[PDB]
Design a binder for this molecule. Structure first.
Ligand code: SF4
Ligand code: F3S
Length: 106
């Protein structure tokens, strides 16, 4: 499974959803998650993310291990997003800011 991590929060560019062959992205107000069960590990999404927030499960940084389980949980409660939409307004101001998990909205 591929995992979306911290830098997506408050950025949510949505370029990743365009490339997914199986539509396994689920949408929150200010973040996206990959459903671990439906992802076929094609790796097509991670060159696409401008925030470089997507990682293969086995490459997730040590300080971001929480995200693996977070993506699995939130994928069960959020709606499926199959079409790209515009980035959040101030997306590039928040891109690269660290510790944005304190700003995650359910
Ligand atoms: S690795 Fe492939 S199947 Fe998994 S979320 Fe990314 S584009 Fe979709
Ligand atoms: S910022 Fe998030 S919405 Fe997709 S394009 Fe990157 S994982």
């Amino acid at each position: 499974a591929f995992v979306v991590t911290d830098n997506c929060i408050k950025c949510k560019y949505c370029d990743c959803v365009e490339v997914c062959p199986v539509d396994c992205f689920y949408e929150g107000p200010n973040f996206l998650v990959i459903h671990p069960d439906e992802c076929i590990d094609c790796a097509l999404c991670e060159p696409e993310c401008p925030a470089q927030a997507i990682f293969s499960e086995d490459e997730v940084p040590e300080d971001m291990q929480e995200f693996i389980q977070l993506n699995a949980e939130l994928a069960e409660v959020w709606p499926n997003i199959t079409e790209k939409k515009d980035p959040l307004p101030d997306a590039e101001d928040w891109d690269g800011v660290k510790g944005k998990l304190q700003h995650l909205e359910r």
